Design a protein around this ligand. Sequence first.
Ligand SMILES: NC(=O)c1ccc[n+]([C@@H]2O[C@H](COP(=O)([O-])OP(=O)(O)OC[C@H]3O[C@@H](n4cnc5c(N)ncnc54)[C@H](O)[C@@H]3O)[C@@H](O)[C@H]2O)c1
Ligand SMILES: [Mg+2]
Length: 318
Amino acid sequence: HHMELRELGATGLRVSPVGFGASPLGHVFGDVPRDVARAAVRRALDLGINFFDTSPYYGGTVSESVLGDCLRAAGVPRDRFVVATKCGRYREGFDFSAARVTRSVDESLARLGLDYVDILHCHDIEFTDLDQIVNETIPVLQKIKESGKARFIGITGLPLSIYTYVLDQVPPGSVDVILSYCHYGINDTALVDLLPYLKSKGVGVISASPLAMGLLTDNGPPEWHPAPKELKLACRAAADHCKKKGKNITKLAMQYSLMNNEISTVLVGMNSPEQVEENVAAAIELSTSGIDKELLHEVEAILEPVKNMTWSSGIEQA
Ligand SMILES: NC(=O)c1ccc[n+]([C@@H]2O[C@H](COP(=O)([O-])OP(=O)(O)OC[C@H]3O[C@@H](n4cnc5c(N)ncnc54)[C@H](O)[C@@H]3O)[C@@H](O)[C@H]2O)c1
Ligand SMILES: [Mg+2]
């Protein structure tokens, strides 16, 4: 069994439904040895994952250096995989200006050891005036796209409102994809309200953080996690409910995020071959056998009170 590739917007690209996020929980592949990173990526390639997301932000540009390292190490044709990186967000702060993103793409390419990336996104745009993205950044990224250094252009961020603001205010065709996170998983599925709109605009959809950055795991979220306490407690109840039955919330959550074919890929942060295996397995078992609907229904009931509860991100707008 393979995983069933999905079409990504109007880009032509065919992507694995499970995608590899190269920085889980805001760390470059967690904090695992390089050999383990290299092996996770190797294992991902071997198991039919062909989509890799990174950025110059998490780990101060080392996410990209390590992914570049891991990719060429695995030794596979350039056209066998799809890479996305981002621009605008750096450890030293945000800068979406024309000169910064133009040099950004080159730096990324140098760190990644590639000639082009498949996707370049503007990163977490809720941290700047959204008119700068409309009026400066997107235009510049067209020129980067023209140059060949990126094939397609993306926007990313947390609040779903960034996406209508931008996509309403740029000429049709300016943006190829969006990356949304934390809005397509058992506790939060608000992204669904955008899929028809984005389809109407010819924009492909990538979703990320199907476990909501660790809320839907046995281990629980990191201490920094910005969720309201209510959501944290509800997710702990869901995890405990699965546990007491000898079942795994992580698996249920991954499968759940994969059940909407209008989302082309779900980026999961992964740090080891074992996590790759479990998530690829979860995808395949969904395809071949379906989800556990009875467990899903009970977990849905626990999360019901906190459905689509979110948190603040970015700055005050216009
Ligand atoms: N604005 C943006 O563009 C933005 C922001 C957030 C995330 N992302 C992307 O999405 C990716 C995924 O998000 P995330 O990693 O923060 O959150 P997530 O919800 O994907 O959870 C990742 C966590 O779950 C653990 N995990 C994964 N599979 C597991 C399994 N089978 N069993 C047990 N634990 C498992 C990981 O080790 C990690 O701690 C990121 O690496 C990144 O590429 C994009
Ligand atoms: Mg404004």
